[PDB]
Amino acid sequence: GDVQNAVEGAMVRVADTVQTSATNSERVPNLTAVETGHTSQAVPGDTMQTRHVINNHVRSESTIENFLARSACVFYLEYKTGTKEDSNSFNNWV
């Protein structure tokens, strides 16, 4: 993708809820080991019987760009109208 070519996106929506039925089995999606360093990729349908929901939500404003690309104040500086003699007639910021 090219972060400088602004007018060139990628629409990625959120994940849908797939319908789950009742179960009685040897597979255990919610029993795991935190020690691994892994995060559980469980979905509610592994624990409950869910309906079918279509999530057209998009993770728009949480994009690094939308998050950082809002103009913030970083510093303000002060200076008077004066002569060479007046130290305060100009100013600087590192």
Partner 1 sequence: GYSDRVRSITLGNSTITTQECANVVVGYGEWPEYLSDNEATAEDQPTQPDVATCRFYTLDSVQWENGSPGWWWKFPDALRDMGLFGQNMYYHYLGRAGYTIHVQCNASKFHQGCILVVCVPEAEMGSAQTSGVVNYEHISKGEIASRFTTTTTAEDHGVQAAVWNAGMGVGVGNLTIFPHQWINLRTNNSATIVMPYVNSVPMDNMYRHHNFTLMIIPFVPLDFSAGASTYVPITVTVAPMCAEYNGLRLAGHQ
What minimum distance in Å lies between the beta carbon of 72 and partner 1? Answer: 34
DSSP letter assigned to residue 16? P
Stretch 2-21 residues interacting with partner 1 (CB under 8 A): 17, 19-20
Count of residues that bind partner 1 according to CB under 8 A: 11
Distance of CA 21 to the CA centre of its chain: 32
67: tokens are 């998050």
83: tokens are 């002569």
| Burial class (CB within 10 angstroms; exposed 0-12, middle 13-18, buried 19+) of 20 | middle
Site string for partner 1, 33-72 (x = CB under 8 A): -----------x---xxxxxxx------------------
Nearest to partner 1 of 48, 64 (CB atom)? 48
Interface contacts to partner 1, rule CB under 8 A = 17, 19-20, 44, 48-54
